[model samples]
Target chain A: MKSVITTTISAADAAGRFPSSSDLESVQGNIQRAASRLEAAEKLAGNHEAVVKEAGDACFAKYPYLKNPGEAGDSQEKINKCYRDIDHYMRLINYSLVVGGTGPLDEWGIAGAREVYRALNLPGSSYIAAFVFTRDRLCVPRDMSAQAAVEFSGALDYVINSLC
Target chain B: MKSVITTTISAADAAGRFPSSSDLESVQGNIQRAASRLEAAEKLAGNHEAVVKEAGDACFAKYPYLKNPGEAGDSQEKINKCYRDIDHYMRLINYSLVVGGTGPLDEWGIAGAREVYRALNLPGSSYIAAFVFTRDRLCVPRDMSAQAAVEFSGALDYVINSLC
Candidate 1:
């Protein structure tokens, strides 16, 4: 089911259009299921902070700062300061999903997402990679609803394509 | 001649196609003239380094660094250390112009440009802005061939559109 829906979504995106309503419904349903799975994982993992911290550490490893804190300057300072703004990151993701999922994926929404990532002093690509890593870590029963998978995959595709 | 050529080129870009051969010839001729103008400016200005230094100083003023030296991290360290690398920054602008102007503007080229700016620990937009500032300052007899203006304008339009 996931493969079928994802393939359709990809085709639609390549054609510069939104997925069919039926396909979107399927994706939305899957996302709901995945959300439940994530909720369970959150309980098991203790809290959102732990999950965010783990993800933040992973991001630092993947996209390490180029200088030491004292000399790196404003860009690095902003990134370091925003590293702890988990709620802000979450809001960005949620907004992207809502805006991107409901209609033809708008370029403005994608740009907004990129701007938020940039404001945090991270490349948009790295920020998305970090989010994917965090999602994988938290919801790792290796089982997600097909719709959810499509939703997540589709959103990232739109955002990355716009920025790249 | 200039207005006719520029209007035609813009229409072609809006349609996602290159200008016609005659239009291209006109643009190319203008670019050659602009190149000569740039050459004269370079000679008068004494060197590219001086222009870059002036722009770099302006950048530091507009977007000051937050942290002191020694602790900001690798990114900041590289930026501070490489602030004098005029050649590197020129290469980025050259590369972006080539890739962005010759083809249907591609996101990958824009992304590469952004990465170059990021390596200097500057926001991508600010880096582009500074480059434009330096270019204007050096070539300030205020004469530009229409082709050169279109080339510069078109490339920036594509890059900024993609990101925004």
Candidate 2:
């Protein structure tokens, strides 16, 4: 995974050159690197569970103070919060991929995620799309409605496959 | 300019219902609808001054307890918090958009909202994206480095926008 940009200085660090232009530049460079790494990891994963796990693991490595780093900052709460978020999303993803059945998370599975996209009424993202694709394949077995499944697939592609 | 979704239920009216599924649905639908309308209004205002005023107006409508609506049910607090959020977002949006700079509110604008989204990270909403888009636009004119803006955006969008 790419390194995360560290732009903001802690209150303690702000008294010196912490918020300097060069400091800002280095942080930005790190952020760009992290984004690039994640993008590359995603390409390599290419639909395999092992690849997905690898990508997630690397992504975790980039975890801002909230993601994995032990240092406490004002954003420590936010970093921990992000950890919980990825954990939540991962739980649903794992359940759908492994169980091949349904649960409460399944309700918000791909179909539910689509409804959320619609509700937000903004341009959607690939992440949301992949969520639905995995959901349909795993949870919506034979009895699932074609309409719902198609909607799920459409939304999935809209997010995961479309970049521009 | 849609109507705020305050159903205006009095103590007597609420007492008449049993908080059944239908009742819950009705309340939720109204809240969602109102929230949508408020968002649209903010977009239409296009700049900070008008957006903040319009958003405040909308908040007053949805949340009768602007100063303080004493605790009633979970909905009261939930509803109260939602309007407060709208007020908060609009305050930052307007401050940065109109003034062309970050303020105290701006610090919390994108980053603070991200914290909320990270915690809430509902399967149904790309709440982070909407926030990122708004924050990006706000920071652009101020000449905040692309790095700072991107860092802030990623800080919020990563978990939500990632390949879930």
Candidate 3:
């Protein structure tokens, strides 16, 4: 797990002295966007469980075979376990959302996730569909900005695509 | 293949008319960040070829076997072709960087990339190493801010990790 390079402040600027006027202006802009970013994150984080459950339900509804014998989500315990993974994924994205970045998926999620997917014999496409359900549902609120709406959905879409 | 949902402006807001004061403030901040964003994009875009070649050189230096018998990089043409792919990857990241987002890889690059990798019998690990070299090289220039620095490195990291 390599960390991302911090580029918010330039090394020369930080090492030499205080920020210049240009830097101050840039920081102020970041501050405003950061507030908007947090606002969007708040919506996603607040609705996490419902979104997860809805996505799970939508998955099973669309592909009832997933709950059929031999599938990973076939049994009650297995289905519950699958829901936990979905919940965990949403939690992972919360980290991405707050920072307005996507490294958490790379650093933490995708590595173990592939292993778990194979081990459990779960299909990636099914999960991708479920993720779409989650994204579409969470993104429909009238309060979210169009940009925020698009970004949030696409961020999750990136996650789903990674599994592919 | 799918498009990222637009969230910068809310569907309701766009449909209902003008942006609110809060919306204006958020957009103003976004505008500022967008300016800084373009600055970083300019550097990366300008130095694209140099970064690719340096990364390729670094990879071969680190692992001589890559250019030795039966390896994908064995021939001059093969290595040249590999550089093209590396270059294409940087181009992909440019899209990610300009938007300060990471979906382009998912939407356009990764799918064909896996196919090409498998067809050509290239090891995912080697390319991952090359990508790291490229990221590290590109990220070290003094002009970029810490946030963009971390982001540019991590965006490529996300791409590299996808290969994993």
Model 1: per-residue Cα lDDT over A1-164, one tens digit each: 12435656877888878677866887776565556434443342345466566655675555454232422223655556545543345444444444334232343344355566554334543454456665555343353344544555454454445545
Better of 1 and 3 by lDDT: 3
Among all windows of 10 consecutive residues in model 3 chain B, the one with the lowest summed lDDT is: B1-10
Give candidate 2's error at residue B130 in angstroms: 11
Q: Give the TM-score of candidate 2.
A: 0.23
Candidates in descending lDDT order: 3, 1, 2
lDDT against true structure, model 3: 0.65
Residue A34 accuracy (lDDT) in model 1? 56
Docking outcome class, model 3? incorrect
Per-residue alpha-carbon lDDT of candidate 2 for residues B73-147, written as tens digits (9 for 90 to 100): 126565455445645665544343333233434356544453344334321132332344344444442533444
Lowest lDDT 10-mer window, candidate 2 chain B? Answer: B1-10
lDDT tens per residue, model 3, A1-164 = 11111222332134342332223333444465555556667877888888889888887888888888999888999899878878877777766656554556556776677887888898877778778887777544574777667657756876787787
User: What interface RMSD does every candidate have?
Assistant: 7.0, 13.9, 12.9
A130, model 3: CA deviation in Å?
1.4
Quote the true-contact fraction of every model.
Answer: 0.00, 0.00, 0.14
lDDT of each: 0.48, 0.38, 0.65
Q: Which window of ten consecutive residues has the lowest lDDT sum in model 1 chain A?
A: A65-74
lDDT per residue (tens digit) for residues B1-164 in model 1: 11435556877888888668877876676565556434443342345466566655665544443232421223565546445543445433444444333232343345465555444333553454455565555333343444444555444444444433
The local lDDT score (0 to 100) that residue B8 gets in candidate 3 is 24
Best candidate, lDDT: 3
